[PDB]
Amino acid sequence: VRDAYIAKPHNCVYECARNEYCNDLCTKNGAKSGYCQWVGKYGNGCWCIELPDNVPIRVPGKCH
Description:
By secondary structure, the chain is an alpha+beta fold. It has a single domain, classed as Defensin A-like, CATH 3.30.30.10. Helices cover about 15% and strands about 40% of the residues. It has one helix and five strands, in the order E-E-E-H-E-E. It has a three-stranded antiparallel β-sheet, with helices on one face. A two-stranded antiparallel ribbon has the order 2-3. Strand 4 (about 35-40) and strand 5 form a beta hairpin. The longest helix has 10 residues, at about 20-30. The protein is globular, with a radius of gyration of 10 Å. The termini are far apart. It is found in: Secreted.
């Protein structure tokens, strides 16, 4: 498992303003929990704790 921003195609974060939305989306994908986290290089995205290894995460690069 890993703590990271969960990703949607192609290498994009799930935009957010509310922590509960991210907790819902993260735990629905098998993570322990999650919250909304600002990142300059990406803005606000959902950050998941204990996300399963097989779930795609944001890595450096361009969202497209």
